Amino acid sequence: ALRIDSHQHFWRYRAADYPWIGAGMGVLARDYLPDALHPLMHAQALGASIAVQARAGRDETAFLLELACDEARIAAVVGWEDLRAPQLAERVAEWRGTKLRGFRHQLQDEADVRAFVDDADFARGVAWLQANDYVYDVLVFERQLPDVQAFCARHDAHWLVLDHAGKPALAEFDRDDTALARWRAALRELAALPHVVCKLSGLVTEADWRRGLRASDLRHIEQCLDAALDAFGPQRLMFGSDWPVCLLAASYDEVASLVERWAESRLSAAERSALWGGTAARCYALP
Ligand SMILES: [Zn+2]
Ligand SMILES: [Zn+2]
Ligand SMILES: [Zn+2]
Ligand SMILES: [Zn+2]
Structure with a gap:
């Protein structure tokens, strides 16, 4: 049974390249590389993680796959490509053989998300991804x-x-x-929809982290975890830390522990095994 952090980021920080890191997010304005992540996963007995594109650009994909190329503690990469480009197939071929398992676009930052996803070129690209067993991560605000x-x-x-x-x-x-x-x-x-699964990650940072997480925030998060469980079922939930972004609100240990405490209450042992890496392993085709 693999234990996997299904969602984290890496970066060599440069302000202009990460526009989403803004005023008051000083903790993120520095390098976060696999060496900093290792002890954090060690303490949670997590064996490997999945690195997700933190910016748009093929070079982010190149960067993550370079970090991952020969590092056993990185099990897969979710990269970035322009999915609307007719050259999509030839460009993805460059990543053949690698740990690339999926793609993500930052839909949440689009002005018309609906017009964007319904776009015929983007649709053609996502259809090609699926025809080739690439996962697609859906990143949207609740309203979207x-x-x-x-x-x-x-x-x-x-x-x-x-x-x-x-x-x-x-x-x-x-x-x-x-x-x-x-x-x-x-x-x-x-x-x-049976082909959609759910990541349980990035919740501490939807709370009002600028004022500081409070006990009431943790209770609300449990209500969301409960609703996710009810809607998706225990076999379609996937733990992720969203490190280093979660550091705006909580430590890696705090992020894992609140999921751990919730899981000990609601889930059987086999279901926990799914939550903590079984589901990520089957959905992202991890070895
Ligand atoms: Zn270790
Ligand atoms: Zn290699
Ligand atoms: Zn298939
Ligand atoms: Zn993230």
Whole structure:
């Protein structure tokens, strides 16, 4: 039974190359490389991780695959390509033989997510990915979930992974008594598709981390974990740390422990084994 952190990032920091790292995120404005990640996974008895593109550009893919090439603690890479380019097939061929297992576009930052995913060229690209057993990670804000519903139903030839449980507006749960229900309804609509699975990661950072995580935030996160479990089922949940991004809000140990405590309560031993690497292993085709 593999134990896998299914979602983390690496980078040599350069401000202009990571526009999403902005004011007040000083902790991220430095290098994070596999050597810093190792002890963190060691403490959680995690054996290997999956490195996910942290910026747009083929060079990010090159970078991650270089880090990964001969490092056993990196089991796969989720890269970046322009999926709308007709040259997509020839460019991906450059990564043949490698640990590349999937792709991700930062849909959340698009101005018209729905127009973007429904685009005929992008659609053609995602269809090619699926025809070739590449996973596609879906990264959207909670409000954008209905915008990708038709896109996820359409692309059903291979696994789609919903990143960060679709980012519930955790900071709003006490101001907005519709926030949890709205997201749960959309989550359920996606989870009804058998080829879509869910990453349980990136939750601490949807809370109001600038003020500091509080006990109420942890309770809301458990409500989201419970809703994810109900909608997806225990065999379609995948742990990820979202390190180093999670450091805005919590330590790696804190991120794993809150999932661990929740899992000991809700899941059987075999289901925990799925959560902690079994599901990532089968969906990303890990050895
Ligand atoms: Zn070790
Ligand atoms: Zn190599
Ligand atoms: Zn296939
Ligand atoms: Zn991430």
